[PDB]
Amino acid sequence: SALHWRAAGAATVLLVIVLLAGSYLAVLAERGAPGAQLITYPRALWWSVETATTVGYGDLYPVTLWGRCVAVVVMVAGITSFGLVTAALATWFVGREQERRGH
Amino acid sequence: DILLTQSPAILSVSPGERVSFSCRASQSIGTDIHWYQQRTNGSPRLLIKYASESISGIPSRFSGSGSGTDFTLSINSVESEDIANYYCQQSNRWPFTFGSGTKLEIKRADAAPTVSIFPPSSEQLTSGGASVVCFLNNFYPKDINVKWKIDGSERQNGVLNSWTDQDSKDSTYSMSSTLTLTKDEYERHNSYTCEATHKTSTSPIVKSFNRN
Amino acid sequence: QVQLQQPGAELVKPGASVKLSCKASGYTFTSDWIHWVKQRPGHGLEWIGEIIPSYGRANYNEKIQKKATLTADKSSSTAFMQLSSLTSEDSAVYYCARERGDGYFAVWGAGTTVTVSSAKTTPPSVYPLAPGSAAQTNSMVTLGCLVKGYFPEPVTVTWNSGSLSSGVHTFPAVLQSDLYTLSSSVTVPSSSWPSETVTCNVAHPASSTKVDKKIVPRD
Amino acid sequence: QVQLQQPGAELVKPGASVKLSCKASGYTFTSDWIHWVKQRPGHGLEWIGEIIPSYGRANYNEKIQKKATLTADKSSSTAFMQLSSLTSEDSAVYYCARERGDGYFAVWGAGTTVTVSSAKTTPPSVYPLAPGSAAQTNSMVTLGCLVKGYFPEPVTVTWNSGSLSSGVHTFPAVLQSDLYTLSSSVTVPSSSWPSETVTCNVAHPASSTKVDKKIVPRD
Ligand SMILES: CCCCCCCCCCCC(=O)OC[C@H](CO)OC(=O)CCCCCCCC
Ligand SMILES: CCCCCCCCCO
Ligand SMILES: [K+]
Ligand SMILES: [K+]
Ligand SMILES: [K+]
Ligand SMILES: [K+]
C-alpha cells in the first residue's frame, strides 16, 4: 500500500499506545496530589481520549506538573495523528483528480 | 480532603426489618462510594461498589443507592449475621477517605442467661493458682449483674468480668466472670457460688460447687 | 486461596521500629496498588498510604504524622511497611489491602496486631473448664478453656481444629499486671460428650506457639 | 381518545405476584419512554421505573426494594409491570405515564388500584336512598345510593350514565369486617324528580360488574 495509508495506520496504533500509556502515567503522576481526580485507570483512559481529540469537557484534568506534561504529550499525539489522516485523505484525493484529468 | 459523615453511629432494628445506613460526603463525589462490613474481630469485607454495584458472594439482601453527596446502604430483612460495623469509603478525590462507621444492633426477644460455674483445673492448681470461672451465656438485653459468694459471704476482690459484643449468630450477649485466688486462699474455703441477676427474672440464677 | 497474607502480631519496644509484610497471591496486574490501613481497638479505619508495585511509587496520608515507609518486592510479590520510632499511640491492627486501580479495596489481609510495650512476650497457659460432679445437665452441656498469662495480644481460639464452630463464644481479653487472660465457651449436645471428643486449640502468634487441650470430665 | 389504558383494579394474595398492563394509543415514537409511578392512599407520587419500548431497556428506582420488572410488547403497543412477592406495603395505585424523551409526563393512565389481601372479591349491593314521606322539600331535592359489602376498592359511581354531574358527592369508603361501604349523593331541582328519571350506576372493576339502580319515590 501507499505511504500515506501505511503512515495513517501506524499513527493510529501509536495513538492507541499513547492513550494507554498516558492513562497509566496520569494516575501515577496524580495520586499523591490532594484534590486530584485523575486517579483511577478507567476514567483516566476516558480522560486521555477526550484530551487527544481535544474535546476537553473539563470533567477530568491533571493538577500536577508531571500529569500536565503527560497531558501535553497526549494532546500533541492526538492532534498530529488526526492531522496525518487528513493529509493522507488529501493525497488520495489529489491522486484521483490527477487521474481524472488524464495527467 | 473529603469528609464522609456516617450518622447515626448506631442503628437499632428488629429482626427481619429493613435498615438503611447513611453516608454524606462534604462535596459531590458522583457515585464513587464503596461500602464495607466488618464483624467483631474480622477484617473489612467489600459489600457494594460504586454506590450501587453488587459484589459476587454478597447476599441479595444488600443494596446501595445515591449519588452526589448523599448515599445509602440498605439491608432488606436484617438477620443476626448482619450485626457488624459498616463503613463507607470514597475514591473520587485523592486521598481516599473512610467514614467513621455505623454499628448495626438488633432488638430481639428477651432471653435469660445460661449460667455455668467451673472449678479451677488440677493443672492450674499445680502451678499454685486457682481460677473459678462463671459463664453467663446467650442472654438479652445486655444489662446483667453477677455476684460472687464464698462460703455464703459476698466476695468482690479478685473478680474480673468480660462482655462480648452482640453475637452475629443469635443476637444475644454473653459475659464471663473470673474469680482468681491463690491456691492457698482457694484451699481454705468450701463452697463458691456465682449469682446472675437479669431482668428476665426477679430471682437470681445461681450456680455453685463445693471444693470437696 | 488467601490473597493477602500478613503476620498475626508484632511486639515493639517504644522508640524502636518494625517492618510489616504482606505477601500477595492470585491475579496480579501492573495497575495494582497495595494500601495500608490502621485501626485502633474500638475505633475506625484510617488510611496510611499506598504503593504501586509495578513502579515503586508510594503516597502517604498528609493529615497524620508519617511513621511509615512503603516498599515492595516484585519477585516475592511482597509489600512492606516500615513503622519507625513507635509509641503506644502506634499500637493497633494494621491491614494491607489490594486495589485494582479502580478505587475500592476488593480484598484485605487478616491484619497484623502491633503492640508497642516494654513488657516481654509470654505464651499462654491453657486450662480446661469442665462441669463439677454436682452440675446437672440438660440437652446441652457447656465446656471451655481458660487462656491466661499471655502477652501481647492476640490469641486465636478454635474448637476441634475449627470443625466445631456453632455454640462458641470467646470473650475479650482482660489486662492485668502486663498479662492478658480470656476464656472461650463451647456448647454441644450433652449426649455427644465425652463420647465425641472436644478440644480447644490456642494459637499465640507473638510466641509462635499453638497448643491443644482436650476437655474431659473431672475425675 | 384515551392515550393510556390501565385496568381498574387487581386483588393479590400476600406473597403472590401480579402483572399490570398499560395499553397505549395515539402518536408513538422511538423516543417514547413508559414510566410507572406508585401512590399510597393519602401520600405522594413515587417513581418506580421506566422502559423504552423501541429498545426494551428498563431502569429502576435504586432507593426502594425492587418489586417490579418492566417489559413491553411492540405489536400490541402494551407496556407491562410485573410486581412479585407482594405485601400490604405494596397496596397502592400504580400509574403508567408516557414521556416523549424530553423529561415530563405529558399523559397519565387512570391508574390500577392494587390491593394485597387474603380476603375474597365481593361485588357491592346497591340500595336506593329516597326521602321519607314526611320530608319537606325546597327548590332542590337530595337523593342517593348506598353501596355496601364490596371488596376490594374501588367502585366508580356516576349518575344517569354520567350525564348528571353537578350536585354530586361520593363519600370515601369505610372498611369494616373485610368489606367496604360508601354512599353517593345527588341533588336536583325538586320539580324535575321523579318526572325526569335519576339513576346511579355503580362499577366494581375487581368483580367486572356494573349495576344500575333507579331512584324512585317511596311507596
Ligand atoms: C514565565 C514563563 C512560564 C514559566 C512557568 C514556570 C516553569 C514551569 C514549571 C515549573 C514547575 C514548578 O516548579 O511548579 C510546579 C507547581 C508546584 O506548586 O505545580 C504545577 O502543577 C504547575 C505545572 C505547570 C505545567 C506546565 C506544563 C508545560 C508542558
Ligand atoms: C511523561 C512524564 C513522565 C512520566 C510520569 C512520571 C511520574 C513520576 C512520579 O511522580
Ligand atoms: K473544552
Ligand atoms: K470545558
Ligand atoms: K467546566
Ligand atoms: K464547571
β content of chain A, as a range?
under 5%
Say what the CATH topology of chain A is: Helix Hairpins
Query: Architecture of the largest domain in chain B in CATH?
Result: Sandwich
Q: What oligomeric state do these chains adopt?
A: part of a larger assembly
Distance N terminus to C terminus of chain B? 67 Å
Strand content of chain B: over 45%
CATH architecture assignment of chain A: Orthogonal Bundle
Please, could you describe this protein's structure?
- This is part of a larger assembly, with one copy of chain A (103 residues), one copy of chain B (212 residues) and two copies of chain C (219 residues).
- Chain A has 103 residues and is an all-alpha fold.
- Chain A has a single domain, classed as Helix Hairpins.
- In chain A, helix 1 packs antiparallel against helix 3 and helix 2 crosses helix 3.
- With 212 residues, chain B is mainly beta.
- Chain B folds into two domains: 108 residues, Sandwich (Immunoglobulin-like), CATH 2.60.40.10; 104 residues, Immunoglobulins (Immunoglobulin-like, Sandwich), CATH 2.60.40.
- The longest helix of chain B has 5 residues.
- The relative contact order of chain B is 0.17.
- Chain C has 219 residues and is mainly beta.
- Chain C folds into two domains: 118 residues, Immunoglobulin-like (Sandwich), CATH 2.60.40; 99 residues, Sandwich (Immunoglobulin-like), CATH 2.60.40.10.
- Chain C contains no helices and 19 strands.
- Classes of the chains: A mainly alpha (103), B mainly beta (212), C mainly beta (219).
- Chains B and C meet through strand 4, strand 5, strand 10, strand 12 and strand 13 of B and strand 5, strand 10, strand 12, strand 13 and strand 17 of C.
- Chain A: One of its GO terms (molecular function) is identical protein binding.
Fold blueprint:
The structure is cut from a larger assembly and holds one copy of chain A (103 residues), one copy of chain B (212 residues) and two copies of chain C (219 residues).
Chain A: H1 3-30, H2 41-52, H3 65-100
Chain B: E1 4-5, E2 10-13, E3 19-25, E4 33-38, E5 45-49, E6 53-54, E7 62-67, E8 70-75, E9 85-90, E10 97-98, E11 102-106, E12 114-118, H1 122-126, E13 129-139, E14 145-150, E15 153-155, E16 159-163, E17 173-182, H2 183-187, E18 191-197, E19 205-210
Parallel strand pairs in B: 2-11
Antiparallel strand pairs in B: 1-3, 3-8, 4-5, 4-9, 5-6, 7-8, 9-10, 9-11, 12-13, 13-17, 14-15, 14-18, 16-17, 18-19
Chain C: E1 4-5, E2 9-12, E3 18-24, E4 33-39, E5 45-52, E6 57-60, E7 68-73, E8 78-83, E9 92-99, E10 105-108, E11 112-116, E12 125-129, E13 140-150, E14 156-159, E15 168-170, E16 174-175, E17 180-189, E18 199-204, E19 209-214
The structure holds (2S)-3-hydroxy-2-(nonanoyloxy)propyl laurate (L2C), nonan-1-ol (F09) and potassium ion (4 copies).
Nonan-1-ol binds next to helix 1 and helix 3 of chain A.
Extracellular side (chain A): 30-40, 60-66
Transmembrane segments (chain A): 7-29, 67-90
Organism (chain A): Streptomyces lividans
